[PDB]
Design an enzyme around this catalytic site. Structure first.
Site, PDB file in Angstrom:
ATOM      1  N   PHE A   1       0.816  -1.221   0.000  1.00  9.36           N
ATOM      2  CA  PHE A   1       0.000   0.000   0.000  1.00  9.36           C
ATOM      3  C   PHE A   1       0.843   1.261   0.000  1.00  9.36           C
ATOM      4  O   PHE A   1       0.498   2.237  -0.658  1.00  9.36           O
ATOM      5  CB  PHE A   1      -1.008   0.022   1.174  1.00  9.36           C
ATOM      6  CG  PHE A   1      -0.387   0.351   2.495  1.00  9.36           C
ATOM      7  CD1 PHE A   1      -0.373   1.665   2.965  1.00  9.36           C
ATOM      8  CD2 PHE A   1       0.229  -0.649   3.258  1.00  9.36           C
ATOM      9  CE1 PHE A   1       0.233   1.978   4.173  1.00  9.36           C
ATOM     10  CE2 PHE A   1       0.832  -0.345   4.470  1.00  9.36           C
ATOM     11  CZ  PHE A   1       0.830   0.971   4.929  1.00  9.36           C
TER      12      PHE A   1
ATOM     13  N   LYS B   1      -0.152  -6.140 -10.151  1.00  5.54           N
ATOM     14  CA  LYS B   1      -1.240  -6.299  -9.219  1.00  5.54           C
ATOM     15  C   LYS B   1      -0.934  -5.514  -7.950  1.00  5.54           C
ATOM     16  O   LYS B   1      -0.310  -6.042  -7.029  1.00  5.54           O
ATOM     17  CB  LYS B   1      -1.441  -7.762  -8.904  1.00  5.54           C
ATOM     18  CG  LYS B   1      -2.828  -8.083  -8.369  1.00  5.54           C
ATOM     19  CD  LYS B   1      -2.805  -8.372  -6.883  1.00  5.54           C
ATOM     20  CE  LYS B   1      -3.131  -7.140  -6.067  1.00  5.54           C
ATOM     21  NZ  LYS B   1      -2.880  -7.327  -4.611  1.00  5.54           N
TER      22      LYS B   1
ATOM     23  N   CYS C   1       9.073   0.330   5.141  1.00  4.50           N
ATOM     24  CA  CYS C   1      10.030  -0.767   5.317  1.00  4.50           C
ATOM     25  C   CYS C   1      11.421  -0.231   5.695  1.00  4.50           C
ATOM     26  O   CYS C   1      12.215  -0.943   6.304  1.00  4.50           O
ATOM     27  CB  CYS C   1      10.088  -1.702   4.083  1.00  4.50           C
ATOM     28  SG  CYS C   1       9.988  -0.924   2.438  1.00  4.50           S
TER      29      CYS C   1
ATOM     30  N   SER D   1       4.545  -7.677   3.542  1.00  7.50           N
ATOM     31  CA  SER D   1       4.903  -8.386   4.763  1.00  7.50           C
ATOM     32  C   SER D   1       5.771  -9.631   4.467  1.00  7.50           C
ATOM     33  O   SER D   1       5.615 -10.302   3.442  1.00  7.50           O
ATOM     34  CB  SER D   1       3.648  -8.755   5.551  1.00  7.50           C
ATOM     35  OG  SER D   1       3.306 -10.114   5.357  1.00  7.50           O
TER      36      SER D   1
ATOM     37  N   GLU E   1       6.807  -5.189  14.052  1.00 10.22           N
ATOM     38  CA  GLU E   1       6.912  -3.981  13.266  1.00 10.22           C
ATOM     39  C   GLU E   1       5.657  -3.142  13.459  1.00 10.22           C
ATOM     40  O   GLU E   1       4.566  -3.579  13.097  1.00 10.22           O
ATOM     41  CB  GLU E   1       7.079  -4.378  11.807  1.00 10.22           C
ATOM     42  CG  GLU E   1       7.252  -3.216  10.843  1.00 10.22           C
ATOM     43  CD  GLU E   1       7.637  -3.678   9.443  1.00 10.22           C
ATOM     44  OE1 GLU E   1       7.466  -4.894   9.149  1.00 10.22           O
ATOM     45  OE2 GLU E   1       8.107  -2.821   8.650  1.00 10.22           O
TER      46      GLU E   1
ATOM     47  N   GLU F   1      -5.100  -2.699  -3.143  1.00  6.27           N
ATOM     48  CA  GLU F   1      -6.476  -2.198  -3.253  1.00  6.27           C
ATOM     49  C   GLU F   1      -6.827  -1.218  -2.131  1.00  6.27           C
ATOM     50  O   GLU F   1      -7.992  -1.124  -1.705  1.00  6.27           O
ATOM     51  CB  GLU F   1      -7.471  -3.356  -3.237  1.00  6.27           C
ATOM     52  CG  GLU F   1      -6.883  -4.678  -3.676  1.00  6.27           C
ATOM     53  CD  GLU F   1      -6.137  -5.381  -2.554  1.00  6.27           C
ATOM     54  OE1 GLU F   1      -4.882  -5.418  -2.603  1.00  6.27           O
ATOM     55  OE2 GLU F   1      -6.806  -5.884  -1.622  1.00  6.27           O
ATOM     56  N   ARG F   2      -5.807  -0.508  -1.655  1.00  4.50           N
ATOM     57  CA  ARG F   2      -5.955   0.496  -0.621  1.00  4.50           C
ATOM     58  C   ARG F   2      -5.840   1.872  -1.251  1.00  4.50           C
ATOM     59  O   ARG F   2      -6.637   2.757  -0.958  1.00  4.50           O
ATOM     60  CB  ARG F   2      -4.887   0.329   0.476  1.00  4.50           C
ATOM     61  CG  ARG F   2      -5.377  -0.310   1.766  1.00  4.50           C
ATOM     62  CD  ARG F   2      -5.303  -1.822   1.704  1.00  4.50           C
ATOM     63  NE  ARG F   2      -6.573  -2.445   2.077  1.00  4.50           N
ATOM     64  CZ  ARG F   2      -6.842  -3.744   1.946  1.00  4.50           C
ATOM     65  NH1 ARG F   2      -5.930  -4.571   1.448  1.00  4.50           N
ATOM     66  NH2 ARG F   2      -8.023  -4.230   2.316  1.00  4.50           N
TER      67      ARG F   2
END
Lengths: 486, 488, 486, 488
Positions: free
Chosen positions: C148, C172, C280, C225, C382, C175-176
């Site tokens: 995202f 791909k 990250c 993740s 995290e 979807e956020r």
């Protein structure tokens, strides 16, 4: 009492020349034997040998070529002592220094074992509609390399390893002070499986050099020595349309920052300055402590280390440093020393009167250390190539950096500090080829490249490493397209 | 009539010498415009400009440096055919030949957008205990370039795009025959956001040349032009301690093997032979059929094709070629094709008759095709640099090959054959730098190296590609260690 | 209001009939929906890509490079527009959105050099009359999953090298915040990239799976993740495909007692609290080494955190903003609580924050913890929120073990003036990306990016030359001829 | 009779496990000896061994490591004969073919002596203001190799040389079918000065393989063997988060164009089709003659040459072929052959009914040659991995090419012709990893890389070459700046 000639076509060989040059033993001062000095005739022969052999060696595939070197390294190790002795006997340097010298040439041989990969070219597909584009790195033909007394093992190898490995045939005109080692090297090379003619050794003087630069069949010349000769060899080479790389003198500075490890610095200085009797393009000449306390304390560490240096001939395995090369050289050193005195420098350790009993005629000068040296002085401007350390006192970093920045010579430099910032700025800015951070003699290993800046080199490629494979090679580019047949 | 000066500090500037040179319209023979002939003062000023300007440029990270060339490329594309009328008007070559000439240069500038990748140096961890060793490539400082009349768009770019990307500043001394193009390019760099001083243009003759060769702050010289002159420029550069690359001229052969597509070859011979009036470092100048048959059908292919060539001013887009550059040059071509007859060669297409109506004082000379050329003749040995194609007949492959081998020149060479073996053997041994297999002008692209061998090259590095990056940089190597500190 | 997909050169609505919501995280509520995708929706995209790729593969590297040039043009021409859509969906600042776009614009810059970057190796005469060379040809069809937080940068990371190598790419994204990727793909048509070459398919785990198992897809890169990475790499490799996957992060900064404290402290504020720390490569753990230096560190940190201007993307004067999702806000408010539960001392309490006019938006005040332990969950999981944890270390060796001993190895930093500490550290540390006096040491596009340990799976990095390695496959040709017309 | 266990920590060592496995002599079918099969406690010991030994090795400088490999190479040439004997005895190929095995691996060892230059990383100065950026290539840690029966010397060196030179520890699980050679290579490496722990041979089963694939401290896995087994070893490794490169099966096609030198094509087909009983992943399974005047004449030269084959044990130095590896390996090759007759093929040379005087019970099969084979047949689809070369007649170039194009396997492919256009078009379009133009077995040398496409390879990095350096290292990228400190 020996006579050395040339080595042409796989054999030790005397010249047609009338002329002959005599080789001293520098520790006793006495004449030990002689070197054939080549005539234009002798030189022409060498090339012809080279010419005949080179097409086929070019035609030997890369892997096979490298196996010659793999055997050559093995052979070198095997002859470590025997090579080291003749070298120390003619040059003066300690056995250990000679072994180090030869080990360094070996390392470039190890590097060139990788020629198959080092020599690949680039390919592209579809540069156009059905058009492919690719380069090939082919030999240059025949090359010559000119070598100084200082390293009669490592610097020939520096040049002939990559040149030969590339498929070239090479001619070495070494220094006629110590010509034994280059000839042994050519012999071991054949014993390792090099075709006759591929590596020839020709001894001689300005005549031989000049014959090399005028000779139409030699495509590329490689030189290490002094800057005024390098400037000549370079220029003359360029006029005769050759490619050329030349590497000259040094006046290498070691900047000591107030936060440096003074003990490591002191010890580094003693080795770097007096090791091999200062007879090195990469020796430290001038120490530049920053600030008054650092300069006082450095001196205080260094003078007892200089005074206690052990001086003897190569036969004395305990000696730290030996005799200088010739009586010419010793006197030139002595002259500089006294001018250091005439110009107001403070000779804190005076090695002028050292005399080694049973060796009075030998070229021995005890180590010397000057303090309060400034840029006006000749001991500053001139490369001494003798056991003489100059301490120049800097008030600060900016002042310190100016010294090496502004010297006509730019071969090596070292800064000693704990401060990453001080180091990165300094190593970044300084207009010198080779920079040592907390390292004194910052000569790169065989798989990197060696070269100074400013007055210390001429040309656009360095010695050994990746650059060398560029120098001994010429690029073909092929553009390929096909019409329809079937 | 227009007055061109030099281009220094981001500005068009008049010379300080009163010395001037003439620029002709080769089509009309007349004189439009004037070039300042640089004094030593003028040159000294470009160097002092460059010397002040470069450190801060040397200090611009390579990505930001890349971005200038990005924009510059867009800028050429915007001024493409306003920049081409300029070239054609001074040189004589057609808007399409200028068009490509500029495009080619523009490609070097696309290659150099990747200077951040391209300028990377090598690192090693633990070459020694605790010890790291690594290279850095830095600007050499101030370089200079000397460029010939044939290509005033491309070859300058070859030199200056890589020079400047590497963090250097450049001075260009172009050919004064056609000096509009060079100054505009310099002017477009400002517009693309190039700091002033970094690219200076200095027009002049030999006096400028020598001014460069001897100036102590100029570190590297790059030259393209005639062999004799290149050899002189190489020498001097070296004596003055500089690094230098020079590329000379050619007599490029084409080899037609029996099995070759005689149409495809015959076609490429006309366009590579006569296009740009034969006025190229890389144009085909000898045709070598292998065998009597091959010869015969080729000669029979070429002649109508040579005859039917449209010759005229850049201003007629129909034209396949145009005026030779200068009256001095056109006479040395004229005289050379004359020695072509005296020397026993049989001329088959004769283009000296040619006069383009009214253009009588234009540098027009039509097509010339020779047959039965021997090695001995002047016409074979010497670079005509004109619309003159010689045809040498060889009985066999081995002899076809012997010809370009034996020749003093050695920039380019082509082979036409369907045989995989003929093409690999040939390209393998031939001692020519650029080699074409079924390709007439084997000019490498910007990401590859350009350079001939033997007498078409002096030095050890090539033009554009990876080599230019090596030429415009100098290596520093750092060996690095620490003393035990606050960590313990 | 309603985003679908972008297949074969124009936006398309999906056949799935399903949708995901898109919140505006400032207001808190929905503003639009994205189509989720079926297998048929996904398959239609692989068919576009299969149709277009060979003619794209055909066009030379130069023409391929030119599209990227013009795409950098347009990317600059829409900078403004782009960072707006990114901001209202993601919640990152307009300036932070600008950085997102630029950091991937710069990969595009990198791949403008694909002609040279795609070169192959050639050998001549590796056997008698035998040559060998290689060609780097397109993999075929690539796929990319992006998280995202970087809907601009990371898609470009993947598709720019992938497409420049002659491949076709299917993206791909998350979807956020899905607007940017369509616009990007749309802008690429405008630069003149053929249709079908860059297609965006949107969806959830259902779409990932349909990519993970489609026979005509060869390569897959993923960031997100660690658990999802794990499985995507896991699943790809099982379907015989090739994969590069990048995961989670717990990036420490170690401040040595001699560091520049202001510079450091200032940095923690940027890297720990930039974009509410949704990164990250954000800093999450401060590890001061002195007892005294941990004290002063906090002394100059607390007023800094406290005075953090929080606001919706629409407040161009804000440092930070809303976290992406109501769900995320809960995860982090849960982690802040376990902190207080587990002994840590919250010295800036941000839970209290509510923003006037935007009371239901996912805003959360900065949180600074102290006396954090490596046994605590605020340390080992995290947060991905505006929460910096300060861990007191007694010494260097003890400090260095913290980042080393942690399941994550994405980024790390050391702040010191000691060249020794920095090198030893960067040398030994467990982590792919190492910053010395640098807070978020993301490498530039010509270098490459990747974590070690649990933060990356596979053997090739993102961008740089590694990226050309991943989207390419080597062919090698050994070539030779019989005697004939020669 | 003999018993081999494992090499762990510098020593030949027995396995703590109960289980053991039989070693046969394929010439006679006797059992000569037994390998121990590793249990998980046996493997774990090996991993802790590597774990202890690796840091210090990684701490030795590149030059010093290269030196070990330099020594190793001399040791290979020193023991070349003992090694080939041991190899050939267990596996069954000629002593001559075993010499190849060792030499093809020894040359990886040569390639890697050059690791100092091979492991360089990239440096960049002033990537930002006062910020330098650069990468280091440190080792991956502990790796493992799983190698098939066919090359128990060559393919271990393929994996362990790159791995170890990069300062990594290695675990080798070779084929338990012919395990004498690897352990000797491990011993020999100890002689060369490799520290204990660095090269460990673990012998075992699928039990060993899983243990490797599931071990938390092994970071990387290289596999060569079956496509089905590759897929498993690949997929499992990845799901355990290891990195993997897997290399599989093959159906190598040779296209013969009408213009080819058939004498040469035919001679090549003999060697590549039958050598070492055709138990090679780079052997030629399919001859694809283009045109019938070619197809007929190829067979005409091909038949005598097959039947002339001398077949014998490794002990008969005269023999072109030994036996196949096991009883099982024979049963499938005999089975598959009968499938050919059963489906239409024309068996122009019958090797079925041939045994050898004194070596009956040893796994011998006479060369077999099929004609009139088609893609629907099983002998076309399957990898036969025995002395069976199928001939498929294609009508034209296009059709001929579809043959390899369409196949599951894309390891290697050859084309034979004099035509430059056909060579280029083929080599370019084909979807096969390694390609030969008038070269029967196009296995790249050690300085290039090995790997097929489609079903034949997995992962994104090949075998040996610069690829393998990239497989056996991770990249760390450092970004560096300094605050103004003690300098003025």
């Amino acid at each position: 009492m020996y006579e050395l000639g040339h080595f042409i076509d796989g054999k030790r060989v005397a010249g047609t020349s009338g002329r002959v040059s005599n080789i001293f033993n520098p520790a006793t001062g006495e004449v030990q034997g002689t070197v054939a000095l080549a005539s234009d005739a002798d030189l022409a022969a060498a090339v012809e040998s080279a010419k005949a052999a080179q097409p086929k060696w070019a035609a030997t595939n890369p892997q096979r070529r490298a196996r010659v070197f793999m055997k050559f390294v093995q052979l070198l190790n095997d002859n470590m002592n025997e090579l080291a002795e003749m070298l120390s006997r003619e040059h003066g340097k300690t056995i250990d220094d000679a072994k180090g010298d030869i080990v360094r040439g070996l390392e470039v041989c190890e590097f060139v074992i990788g020629i198959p990969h080092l020599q690949k070219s680039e390919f592209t597909e579809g540069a156009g509609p059905g058009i492919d584009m690719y380069s090939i790195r082919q030999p240059v033909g025949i090359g010559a390399g000119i070598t100084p007394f200082n390293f009669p093992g490592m610097i020939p190898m520096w040049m002939f390893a990559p040149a030969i490995a590339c498929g070239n045939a090479f001619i070495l005109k070494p220094s006629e002070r110590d010509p034994s080692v280059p000839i042994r090297l050519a012999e071991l090379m054949i014993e390792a499986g090099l075709p006759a003619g591929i590596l020839n050794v020709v001894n001689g003087d300005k005549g031989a050099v000049d014959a090399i630069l005028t000779h139409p069949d030699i495509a590329a010349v490689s030189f290490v020595g002094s800057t005024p000769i390098a400037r000549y060899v370079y220029g003359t080479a360029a006029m005769n349309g050759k490619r050329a790389q030349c590497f000259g003198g040094a006046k290498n500075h070691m900047i000591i920052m107030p936060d440096a490890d003074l003990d490591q610095a002191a010890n580094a200085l003693i080795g770097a300055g007096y090791g091999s009797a200062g007879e090195r393009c990469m020796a430290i000449s001038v120490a530049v402590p920053v600030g008054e306390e650092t300069a006082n304390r450095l001196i205080d560490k260094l003078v007892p280390m200089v005074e206690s240096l052990r001086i003897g001939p190569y036969t004395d395995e305990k000696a730290d440093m030996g005799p200088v090369v010739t009586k010419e050289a010793e006197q030139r050193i002595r002259s500089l020393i006294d001018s250091g005195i005439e110009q107001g420098a403070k000779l804190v350790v005076d090695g002028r009167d050292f005399k080694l009993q049973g060796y009075e005629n030998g070229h021995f000068i005890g180590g010397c250390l000057f303090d309060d040296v400034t840029p006006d002085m000749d001991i500053y401007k001139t490369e001494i190539f003798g056991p003489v350390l100059s301490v120049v006192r800097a008030r600060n970093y900016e002042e310190a950096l100016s010294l090496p920045m502004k010297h006509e010579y730019g071969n090596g430099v070292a800064i000693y500090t704990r401060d990453g910032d001080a180091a990165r700025d300094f190593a970044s800015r300084i207009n010198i080829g080779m920079v040592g951070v907390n390292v004194p003699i910052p000569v790169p290993l065989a798989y990197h490249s060696f070269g100074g800046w400013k007055s210390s080199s001429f040309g656009d490629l360095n010695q050994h490493g990746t650059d060398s494979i560029k120098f001994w090679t010429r690029t073909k580019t092929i553009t390929s397209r096909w019409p329809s047949g079937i």
